[PDB]
Amino acid sequence: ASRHGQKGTIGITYRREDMPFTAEGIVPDLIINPHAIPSRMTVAHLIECLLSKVAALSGNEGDASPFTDITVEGISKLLREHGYQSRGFEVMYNGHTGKKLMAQIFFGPTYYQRLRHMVDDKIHARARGPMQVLTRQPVEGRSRDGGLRFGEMERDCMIAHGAASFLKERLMEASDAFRVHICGICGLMTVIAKLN
Amino acid sequence: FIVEDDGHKELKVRKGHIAKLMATEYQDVEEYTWSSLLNEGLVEYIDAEEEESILIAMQPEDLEPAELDVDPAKRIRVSHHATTFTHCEIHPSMILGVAASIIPFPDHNQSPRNTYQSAMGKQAMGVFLTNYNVRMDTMANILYYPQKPLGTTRAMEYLKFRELPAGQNAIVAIACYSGY
Amino acid sequence: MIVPVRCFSCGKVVGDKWESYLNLLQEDELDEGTALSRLGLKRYCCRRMILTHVDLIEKFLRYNP
Amino acid sequence: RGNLMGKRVDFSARTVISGDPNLELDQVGVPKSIAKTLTYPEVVTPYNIDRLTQLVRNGPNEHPGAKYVIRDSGDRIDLRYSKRAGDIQLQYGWKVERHIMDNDPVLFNRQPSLHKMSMMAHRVKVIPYSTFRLNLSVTSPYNADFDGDEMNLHVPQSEETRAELSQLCAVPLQIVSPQSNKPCMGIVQDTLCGIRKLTLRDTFIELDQVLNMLYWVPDWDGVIPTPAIIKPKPLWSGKQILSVAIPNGIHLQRFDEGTTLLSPKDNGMLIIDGQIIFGVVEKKTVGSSNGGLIHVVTREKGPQVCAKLFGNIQKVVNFWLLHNGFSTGIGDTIADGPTMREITETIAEAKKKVLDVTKEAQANLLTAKHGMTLRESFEDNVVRFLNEARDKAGRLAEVNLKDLNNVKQMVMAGSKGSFINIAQMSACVGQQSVEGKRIAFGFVDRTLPHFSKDDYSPESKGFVENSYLRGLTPQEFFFHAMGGREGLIDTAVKTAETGYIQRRLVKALEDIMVHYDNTTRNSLGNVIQFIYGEDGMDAAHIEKQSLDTIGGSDAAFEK
Amino acid sequence: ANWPLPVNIRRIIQNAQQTFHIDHTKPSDLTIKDIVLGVKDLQENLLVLRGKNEIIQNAQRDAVTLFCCLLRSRLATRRVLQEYRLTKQAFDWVLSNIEAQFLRSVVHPGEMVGVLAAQSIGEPATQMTLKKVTSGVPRLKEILNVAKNMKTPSLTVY
Amino acid sequence: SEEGPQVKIREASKDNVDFILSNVDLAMANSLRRVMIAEIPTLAIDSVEVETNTTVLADEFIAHRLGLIPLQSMDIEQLEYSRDCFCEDHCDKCSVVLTLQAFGESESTTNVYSKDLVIVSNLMGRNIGHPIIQDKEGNGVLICKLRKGQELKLTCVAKKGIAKEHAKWGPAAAIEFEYDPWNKLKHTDYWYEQDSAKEWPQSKNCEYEDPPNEGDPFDYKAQADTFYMNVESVGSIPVDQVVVRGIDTLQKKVASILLALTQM
Amino acid sequence: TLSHLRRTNTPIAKPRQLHNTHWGLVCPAETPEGQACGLVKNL
Amino acid sequence: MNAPDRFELFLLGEGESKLKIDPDTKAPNAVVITFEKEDHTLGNLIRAELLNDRKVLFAAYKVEHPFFARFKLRIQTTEGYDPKDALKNACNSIINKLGALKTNFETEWNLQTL
Amino acid sequence: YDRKVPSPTGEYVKEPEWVLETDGVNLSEVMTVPGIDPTRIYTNSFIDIMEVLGIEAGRAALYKEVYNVIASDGSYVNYRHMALLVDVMTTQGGLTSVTRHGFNRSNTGALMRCSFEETVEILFEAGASAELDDCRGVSENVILGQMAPIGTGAFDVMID
Amino acid sequence: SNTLFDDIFQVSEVDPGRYNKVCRIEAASTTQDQCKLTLDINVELFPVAAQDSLTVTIASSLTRSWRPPQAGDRSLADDYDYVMYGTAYKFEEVSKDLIAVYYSFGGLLMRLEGNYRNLNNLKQENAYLLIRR
Amino acid sequence: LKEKAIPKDQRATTPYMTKYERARILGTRALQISMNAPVFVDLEGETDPLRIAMKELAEKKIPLVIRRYLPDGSFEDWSVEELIVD
RNA sequence: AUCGAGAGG
Ligand SMILES: Nc1ncnc2c1ncn2[C@@H]1O[C@H](COP(=O)(O)OP(=O)(O)OP(=O)(O)O)[C@@H](O)[C@H]1O
Ligand SMILES: [Mg+2]
Ligand SMILES: [Zn+2]
Ligand SMILES: [Zn+2]
Ligand SMILES: [Zn+2]
């Protein structure tokens, strides 16, 4: 996730040759979708990319301190002295084609952080599993190889779909299926049955 | 900071005390501390009720009397319109918390996303301390090549985030590439 | 903790430069950017790897064990 | 409530989900390790046994494998352990628990169980990487934007159950929503932006790109489109390749703005026989909305054609967009200096009007509407002035923003962005609203300790002139933070309340079902509706249309 | 004019026009009598409920009334000839398609209506975001609770 | 001279070569550049076994650092891929083995450089596995800095590799491409708030090409024959060799396709 | 680490909402997200 | 964990045919060739040379997924031109051009003095 | 209001209409006054409308109020879904709450009532009641684990 | 193999339109009072002037895959500069004795007027537009 | 209470199979095909039981009686062959 | 287990 509000999973790892290449040849370590930004309404992510590029080419450290007077136009002028676009919009060549991309792509140095949450820890799959004895139900959690909870509201979605048997197999065969003998005369399971 | 009449009502601390503070800071002679400012009385501690009684100015420059081109990009600032200010706040950034101080430009960004980054940064991996190889904590995560942020708040040098960074300055391009 | 070997985007080595660069900024009182130019690390990503990097290894080295 | 209604269930898996454009919408990408963990019992059959022999040979570690074989006696045989597993004979009437295999039905669910649509059956496609993969479109009914979103998959253990999932819970069957009578899934994100850009007449496609896109359509006619322009150079409009993607035999007419048949604005659309005569593709045609192309395709051609169409459109458009590229950029936020000066003058005018109304209030010479306190009237008028000022400022900016800037392109497609986002970044974020009110004086007479006493002026009240790009003054930032805090509280409060509500509604209405007499009855059989929905008809297959007799002149009706 | 409608007639007519490649110059083959009688026959052969009970037949007639009105608006003898030069066969095809589409449109017996209705409220309600009235989730809570107290009671006097 | 693509080199350095390529199909220049990054084979350490590690850096971290260090690959074609080779773990032809043992004797923080690394496997007269140092001091890239009283003992085995498997094996870090600098082809539409010319800098590569006359119409047929490129070499493989090897590797891939068709 | 050390927790007439009194003493934007949002604040 | 090896993309395993050739459906001369363990950079080259040849009506390259390095190219040829023959000629032409460039570059480097 | 009425021609035209909005509701008194149309008048509270005009007017007003909420969103829900809830409250002569008061209290079933709230109290009273549960309800069937007479389960399937 | 209609037109107006490459063209028939044409042309493809006379022809011929031009195989169906292929969205009559013809080529739009050429205008979707200097 | 027969001449129910009915019939037949119970239809090229059940339903080979039910509980029976599928 | 705390959507 970025230092600004936006967070994300990496959908794919792309080799450098595939990734679009500027004339300078810098390949972005990270590619983010444009469509996320306008609804996020965080201009400062864009601002940070611009300021960091200016700072890196100058070598000078760049101050983002809040409530300190900064001109995006001034930073743009500094980028123009560097020769990089005031926008930071960079002409990019599509990697597989070698063709120039029709629309130039924003290219900036963005601070980014690695979130603690990771897939490899998170994933849990249990086809069959240990059962807590009294419930006879699946145990809870990855550590105990536990079965995921089927919500009653989830059950409601299933009823709305109308399939009695999927709900039934999840409800009895998958968890705490049980056979008993109830006495008809008592109406109550007073009966204990020796089958042998 | 305390502001009292002299001629024009001016911040009490003045340039000279700052120069002496910086001289003591460079030394690492006459000793200058925050307690010295308080003994001098230039700076005072104000509780919320006392704050209701006081009238304060964000900017030290705003208190000094104002007597025409302005750059368009500069944020529109209402003139304070107030004759007398008891005190002047040291910096707006000081009201912001440490996690807010981390955010590059909260001033240019929406508040909810600032909150979300504050939440994410505690989760974000960084080297916790130099003692870690000696230490045995139950779970620790350390970045392979921690890199200081390219854009730093003035608050961060006090926060020591630059010294123990939690992020990498990845080159980031905003593009549509096969929908991932 | 230690100077990265290469700029991840470029892949150009950055390990050799660092020591010189530090001495360099003290030797000529040079601004960091001109020192980067002398290093030849022209790509701002190559520059980025050095400027953003800090050596925490010295701090780990201070520990006696 | 927690064990009998809901049970932790076997064969339940969860993963972080990521979206893959190539994968078809009906299919879910299942990480290989989970599929290997997960077993489905398959009875050996004469056709089945020969394949199953090899799958047992490949074993637990490699899929197609089998964790267990089940005897007629049914004492468990553990395959990974078994020495005999090398030498087993498959026998008949013996159930082999297959590793989960591609093109096998499963159920994929986002944790909000608000919707039946949220739990949808998907075809299994086994993928190497660990993340569950899903189409970009199928996100919308799931309501999952997967920055960290985790989704849960349940595998049927019975063939009757598998049949129920495939025959009723499939994504194609759930495309058209029972409620709101509109498709649930539409083309999303870069596919929509790129479909708009491709459809523009200005955009043109060369023959090499045309051939690659033709090839990209999984089913192609094999007949190269006749060039839209032949003689100067063979050129193809983007609409023609997109039309090759459109299922043949489908006709769409759309008129919202003045949509002449000439259609110089190119608003609206005519498709004939899966070939599009005029228009630039916009969100509504390609949208979840009723009268969208997806609704027409799903009803006209059946559901499977619609889902495949989703896929084909996504592939062609994404390829085109990847060739053109897209970047939001800083400069789309930046605004022209002339327009910025007009913007500042607008804000100043609103400020002077607020002061003049305040002065009239100070004079005590005022007109108070009956049933409105005079302070109430003053505050309402001032609040309206500031609201109108921010909206007008944004509108001036929107006109100023050029056709080329990307935020407008995202909005014109309708992919992402809105006028309010444009306005707040461009000119003015507006007055902060707390508890349906302008910012209050926590200190008596002062909104902020910096602010002077008894100030009802907009700056004290916290209406923020400043653009996000321009930057925010500290007071403005604190006001925005107060409003945001209230908003987040209300977000969580609304969720909790909706949970209690939705549960109450479901518990009340669970018993009620259509019956064969078509009476709509509870479990007792008390008839809520003699004919369900007072039409005795499914909510699906109902599209709004104009009734011609009503409306118009009486003379027009007779003529 | 716009109301939820069981079958989209205009789509059927457009599909017919392209399918039969109809020309406007050629006179309609179709008898005026046959247009009127066929529209009436199509109205007759749509059943929300099977069988004949006078109450059941009447409840169906009430049920089909709005759809019948839509069909009469969509196909008038004069309108049938003017809007399109329907071959008599294309009109018969339109009739068959309309009947079949309505039959598909009828709810399959046994679908659980109430759970669907509750979810159908719920997702808007989850997404539901909050001249002054009780609004949104609080207003909905008042409606559902049937509480006597109203935060903003109001009477509309006409 | 030869009919077909003709290349004129603007600049020759051991690190980098800047050339102008004419009468080339662009897809071929892109194909060659992607081959040049990925397909060119080079030797880097694929296995590191550490006897003892006292340094603060973890062994995996050190091993990674070692993997990135440049190893000379002029004779890498003579070397055989280990998976191709008959030996078990390593034969001397497939594997070049480098050992380093460093103890922090110095009170001053010890420094471990690429120059300290030494080879224990017979060269057999091929110039392979020598650490390459461009430093004026000749001080190698620092794998680790050693505290006084700290000793790290490791052996490293270097196997043939390709960049598609891992980034370290790729010989060339940066490759610069410029085509249609004047935008006569108009492949890309510039984003300009007011004027395109002021917002986008003129490329130096524009200057070589004659500026387009305003009167002439845009021609749909034309595809740019001339591209301006520059290659940057680590120097594990020299620049001239690097570009020739990229060309040759593409030829080998094409020949494999042709032979596969003949076998079919 | 630093942020966890400076924390305020309010047991539980609108405590969550930012107050004018809160200005200059509490971070405007650092708050729990989810249930008990705004009850807990960082100085 | 679940992720596949870089080498698996790199090299053919389990006796994968490097080239699979199957008839196209609905175009008479067209044929589809599945390159296996092959990357984009060769495929666009083969296709460009195929486009250059007058006789091939259709040439396109498509990859089903980025995950797996399988590349599909479809060629439709004029009548009297075998598709496989067309592919051979295009590939040989690429090789000739590559050799010509290498020789010209070698001469140029010898001319270069640095 | 600015409501639209038929023209003499019959083209729908719009006439400005004068209206009054009242803070309080006293429906019976307001309706028996001059200068108002008794037919047109409406009360935002559904219960007052139901008491003055009967249950069916109350159900109409209930759907109208739910519709106003959904319209404030701009969302649209098909009339059948809202209608079913309104009719469930309406079919019982008194307007019936979604809350446990009333909805759980409706006699039919024992387990369907027990699931929502006050489970054990319901079961205790039922034990004293000696209530017989058909177990026809979906939630009841889930508790049994027996296949519910729901969707696919409802119709019996027999051999030829 | 007969052109369905041939016309000589003088273009009244060039409109740049929303799209820069494709400009709208407003044109009046020469020697006919009642024939009017509104076309979408590509200015990059075709030089245009505010006043200009261009020959306009519609042909049924000179499905089938577009075959790449082989110069020996190719006989120019036309020496005309500009050719488009497309389908009429509608044939209408603005007035009695005044047929209006609407032809679209990949979304590019064409308006034609008069009943002298309506017999020349045909129901079949296929059309080739030929524009000559 | 008992023998709540619905005359075969006097049945009113939707002739079309409920989608739930088709799903249950197809799944039951597929279970039988997995059970390896004899399949009447000629089968070409499908292992899967569900595909076979679908073909058998289109053939109408599947003999099954679906008891259309009413809230009263009088039982009307529609043979699979009788019920229209489309 | 239990209870708590914290965190993700
Ligand atoms: N319904 C929506 N309409 C418009 N934009 C949206 C919507 N939902 C999310 N976005 C936008 O998508 C991006 C990421 O989603 P966002 O940050 O809102 O997630 P979230 O609200 O935390 O998620 P969740 O819906 O799971 O609670 C942001 O730009 C956000 O504005
Ligand atoms: Mg999310
Ligand atoms: Zn008993
Ligand atoms: Zn670099
Ligand atoms: Zn070997």
Side-chain angles (χ1 to χ4, degrees), chain K residues 42-60:
Chain K
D42 287 26
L43 313 94
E44 182 273 300
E46 288 95 15
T47 166
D48 159 62
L50 215 36
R51 288 280 329 275
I52 297 322
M54 294 179 336
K55 155 162 201 53
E56 274 170 295
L57 171 142
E59 294 315 288
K60 270 305 171 73

Side-chain angles (χ1 to χ4, degrees), chain D residues 91-361:
Chain D
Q91 202 80 346
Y92 272 140
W94 283 20
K95 313 162 191 63
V96 185
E97 319 210 347
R98 333 192 271 95
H99 275 48
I100 287 306
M101 291 224 65
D102 311 64
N103 299 10
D104 295 8
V106 286
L107 258 168
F108 206 47
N109 169 56
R110 218 230 183 275
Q111 329 288 148
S113 42
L114 53 91
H115 264 208
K116 44 148 61 183
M117 266 71 49
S118 299
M119 302 219 288
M120 266 161 24
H122 278 60
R123 271 214 309 278
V124 153
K125 200 244 212 173
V126 184
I127 45 152
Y129 293 79
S130 46
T131 61
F132 268 116
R133 313 289 286 203
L134 70 167
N135 200 345
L136 321 171
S137 273
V138 66
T139 65
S140 298
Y142 280 95
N143 200 359
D145 209 25
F146 29 82
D147 37 18
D149 297 20
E150 294 187 313
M151 291 203 46
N152 317 339
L153 185 142
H154 299 40
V155 192
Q157 299 311 289
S158 324
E159 190 40 68
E160 39 166 57
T161 300
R162 290 162 114 265
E164 295 184 326
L165 269 72
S166 34
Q167 292 334 290
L168 321 172
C169 314
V171 197
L173 300 191
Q174 301 298 335
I175 297 158
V176 284
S177 72
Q179 92 197 70
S180 314
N181 60 70
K182 53 93 181 183
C184 321
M185 296 133 264
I187 275 53
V188 279
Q189 300 262 19
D190 305 347
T191 55
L192 166 60
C193 155
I195 198 159
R196 198 179 47 76
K197 314 185 44 59
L198 171 85
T199 315
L200 323 159
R201 285 82 80 80
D202 217 20
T203 290
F204 275 130
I205 313 303
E206 289 261 28
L207 70 142
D208 38 49
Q209 206 163 353
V210 157
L211 288 200
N212 294 121
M213 289 145 152
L214 275 38
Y215 201 32
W216 255 120
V217 201
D219 303 358
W220 180 39
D221 59 34
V223 184
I224 282 81
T226 298
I229 295 102
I230 317 185
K231 195 84 194 285
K233 173 153 211 272
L235 270 294
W236 287 260
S237 147
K239 315 143 183 80
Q240 330 186 265
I241 170 61
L242 184 58
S243 319
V244 182
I246 307 175
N248 287 3
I250 295 188
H251 310 270
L252 188 98
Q253 245 186 344
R254 216 189 62 65
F255 318 90
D256 43 8
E257 159 57 53
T259 317
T260 82
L261 271 284
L262 261 183
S263 199
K265 229 55 83 175
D266 211 57
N267 78 110
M269 229 89 63
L270 172 57
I271 310 193
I272 287 305
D273 213 274
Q275 316 308 129
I276 178 176
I277 288 85
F278 73 94
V280 168
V281 178
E282 45 92 17
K283 183 154 212 143
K284 307 169 321 265
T285 52
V286 73
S288 86
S289 57
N290 197 334
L293 176 52
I294 289 94
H295 199 157
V296 183
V297 177
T298 322
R299 304 253 171 262
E300 272 275 90
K301 328 292 268 198
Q304 284 81 19
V305 178
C306 211
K308 184 132 91 163
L309 160 73
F310 273 97
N312 313 349
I313 301 283
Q314 286 162 302
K315 297 139 194 154
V316 192
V317 173
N318 288 313
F319 171 99
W320 182 93
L321 190 43
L322 169 141
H323 287 37
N324 298 249
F326 202 50
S327 51
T328 286
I330 63 146
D332 299 47
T333 61
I334 211 165
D336 293 58
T339 292
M340 275 300 204
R341 278 176 259 109
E342 300 207 2
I343 279 284
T344 63
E345 301 193 348
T346 291
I347 311 307
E349 145 194 306
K351 258 204 100 76
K352 321 303 164 262
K353 305 315 152 289
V354 171
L355 162 73
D356 296 2
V357 183
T358 315
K359 196 35 81 183
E360 145 157 32

Side-chain angles (χ1 to χ4, degrees), chain F residues 37-227:
Chain F
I37 319 148
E39 304 325 341
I40 312 192
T42 289
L43 185 93
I45 291 99
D46 222 300
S47 89
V48 179
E49 49 185 289
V50 52
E51 168 161 37
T52 60
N53 180 46
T54 55
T55 196
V56 280
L57 321 186
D59 316 346
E60 295 103 340
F61 182 91
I62 303 152
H64 177 75
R65 304 199 43 77
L66 300 155
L68 293 300
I69 314 175
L71 316 186
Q72 164 70 229
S73 292
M74 169 59 91
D75 299 55
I76 193 47
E77 306 299 325
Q78 290 90 302
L79 192 139
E80 158 137 8
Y81 269 98
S82 147
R83 76 213 161 212
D84 287 345
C85 148
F86 319 107
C87 79
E88 301 330 299
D89 278 20
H90 325 288
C91 60
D92 173 283
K93 34 181 82 182
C94 82
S95 60
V96 175
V97 176
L98 283 289
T99 185
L100 200 41
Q101 293 202 350
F103 165 62
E105 172 266 350
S106 51
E107 312 216 20
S108 91
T109 284
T110 325
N111 283 38
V112 178
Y113 293 157
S114 82
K115 101 172 202 198
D116 315 338
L117 255 198
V118 81
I119 320 164
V120 298
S121 201
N122 178 27
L123 295 125
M124 295 197 176
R126 35 180 179 191
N127 202 293
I128 285 304
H130 315 72
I132 320 88
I133 325 188
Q134 285 111 339
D135 181 17
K136 327 287 114 174
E137 298 83 275
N139 295 22
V141 53
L142 175 96
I143 316 96
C144 182
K145 264 181 301 213
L146 261 189
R147 157 158 200 75
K148 184 193 202 213
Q150 273 183 13
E151 183 213 21
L152 159 72
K153 314 194 260 306
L154 43 79
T155 85
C156 302
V157 181
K159 297 174 212 189
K160 206 155 166 164
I162 211 165
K164 162 201 286 213
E165 315 154 327
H166 200 279
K168 49 207 189 147
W169 285 314
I175 310 86
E176 149 188 352
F177 196 120
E178 202 74 292
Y179 87 87
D180 191 35
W182 280 138
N183 203 48
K184 321 206 210 225
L185 273 305
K186 313 140 50 184
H187 278 274
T188 169
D189 199 335
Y190 277 145
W191 182 105
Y192 62 104
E193 41 196 40
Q194 331 289 120
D195 161 50
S196 152
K198 54 151 180 273
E199 262 159 277
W200 308 84
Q202 64 292 29
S203 149
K204 45 162 291 303
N205 294 299
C206 302
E207 151 175 39
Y208 309 108
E209 265 159 49
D210 255 342
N213 164 47
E214 69 290 334
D216 44 60
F218 146 69
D219 161 51
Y220 29 68
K221 281 319 300 183
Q223 268 79 255
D225 61 16
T226 299
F227 322 120

Side-chain angles (χ1 to χ4, degrees), chain A residues 80 87 93 96 100 104, chain F residues 30 178 180 188 193 199:
Chain A
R80 296 324 272 134
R87 295 311 151 259
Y93 294 60
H96 303 135
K100 271 184 285 194
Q104 300 84 212
Chain F
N30 158 56
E178 202 74 292
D180 191 35
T188 169
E193 41 196 40
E199 262 159 277

